[PDB]
Amino acid sequence: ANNIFDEKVYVNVELSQQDNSIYVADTLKEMVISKLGRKLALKHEADDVINVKMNNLEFIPLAYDKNGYVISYKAKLNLDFNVVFKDGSSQAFSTSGSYNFEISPNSIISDSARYEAIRAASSEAFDEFISVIA
């Protein structure tokens, strides 16, 4: 738990166009700020600013049953980061994350399964974001 940010960080999370559209943006915000160990702050009251945009969200089939129905998915995504520190320096880079889950044959991925897959993959992506900065 050793980070380079200052005590107050402003976090803005955007997601790409989708329409299966689920709410995760505020989950991602509260997730990364808890990983960073700092306290959230308003944009013009903050020392540092992190802009996060989830991109390339995809559900890739991992396994099929005897009939050819998909029974296992790998969700993966990128988080595109634009960090502006208190100094003014900027780092733009992305990290990746993925999450494998099973599903009943030829059913539709529930909103709960979609949420948890995005949450978990984003969680992994944030972890690599942390290590990139430290």
Q: Residue 126: name the closest of 86, 83, 78 by CA.
A: 78
CB 70 within 8 A of CB 49: no
Both tokens assigned to 107: 């059913």
- Report yes or no on 2 lying in a domain: no
Asked if residue 66 is part of any domain, the answer here is yes
Residue 3 lies in a domain: no
**Resolution of the experimentally solved model in angstroms:** 2.4
Dist. CA 28–CA 98, nearest whole Å: 15
Q: What is the DSSP string of the chain?
A: ----S-SEEEEEEEE---------HHHHHHHHHHHHT-EE--GGG-SEEEEEEEEEEEEEEEEE-TTS-EEEEEEEEEEEEEEE-SSS-EEEEEEEEEEEEE--TT-PPPHHHHHHHHHHHHHHHHHHHHHHH-
The whole domain housing 28 covers 8-133
- Whether residue 50 lies inside any domain: the answer is yes
Cβ count within 10 A of residue 96:
13
Report if residue 26 sits inside a domain: yes
Number of domains making up the chain: 1
| Cα 101 to Cα 40: distance, rounded to the nearest angstrom | 32
Residue 43 forms part of a structural domain? yes
State how far Cα 124 lies from the chain centre. 8
